[PDB]
């Protein structure tokens, strides 16, 4: 089994990653992605921080008790046209993460993850897509929620 992870540059501690580049990602994978990231799911107030700085996807991901895009510039294509930290309603289906690394600095930061630094050992062959487009491959495990795994 095979689990591909594409990762954006740190905004003020701030990522997105997406799973397998599609909508695969529930509330508690999410929490175990951000944990192995040495992580945690961002608050609004720590999401509106990073859109400050430049930071704006067209992907639903999840945060802290929500499902957001953050949005600078409108485009009808993304979160219905809206600009700022868009939240949508019907979030029992399954998307992308956002997480939060507080010891990142309160810049952009496009640093290279060479791994996933807090997953455990298993039989996942798991990657890494930074923004230059290295892959960065290791054998482990990080998800915790049998209703995941299964």
Same mark, same amino acid.
């Given at each position: 089994?095979? !689990?591909?992870?594409?990762?954006?540059?740190?905004?003020?501690?701030?990522?997105? +990653?997406?799973?397998?580049?599609?909508?695969?990602?529930?509330?508690?994978?999410?929490?175990?992605?951000?944990?192995?990231?040495?992580?945690?799911?961002?608050?609004?107030?720590?999401?509106?921080?990073?859109?400050?700085?430049?930071?704006?996807?067209?992907?639903?991901?999840?945060?802290?008790?929500? /499902? /957001? !895009?953050?949005?600078?510039?409108?485009?009808?294509?993304?979160?219905?046209?809206?600009?700022? +930290?868009?939240?949508?309603?019907?979030?029992?289906?399954?998307?992308?993460?956002?997480?939060?690394?507080?010891?990142?600095?309160?810049?952009?930061?496009?640093?290279? +993850?060479?791994?996933?630094?807090?997953?455990?050992?298993?039989? !996942?062959?798991?990657?890494? /897509?930074?923004?230059?487009?290295?892959?960065? /491959?290791?054998?482990?495990?990080?998800?915790?929620?049998?209703?995941?795994?299964?």
């Amino acid at each position: 089994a095979q !689990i591909d992870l594409n990762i954006t540059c740190r905004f003020a501690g701030v990522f997105h +990653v997406e799973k397998n580049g599609r909508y695969s990602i529930s509330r508690t994978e999410a929490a175990d992605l951000c944990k192995a990231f040495n992580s945690t799911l961002p608050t609004m107030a720590q999401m509106e921080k990073a859109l400050s700085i430049g930071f704006e996807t067209c992907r639903y991901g999840f945060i802290e008790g929500h /499902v /957001v !895009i953050p949005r600078i510039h409108p485009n009808s294509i993304c979160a219905a046209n809206n600009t700022g +930290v868009y939240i949508l309603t019907s979030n029992t289906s399954q998307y992308d993460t956002y997480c939060f690394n507080a010891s990142a600095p309160p810049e952009e930061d496009c640093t290279s +993850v060479t791994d996933l630094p807090n997953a455990f050992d298993g039989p !996942i062959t798991i990657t890494i /897509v930074n923004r230059d487009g290295t892959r960065y /491959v290791q054998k482990g495990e990080y998800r915790t929620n049998p209703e995941d795994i299964y």
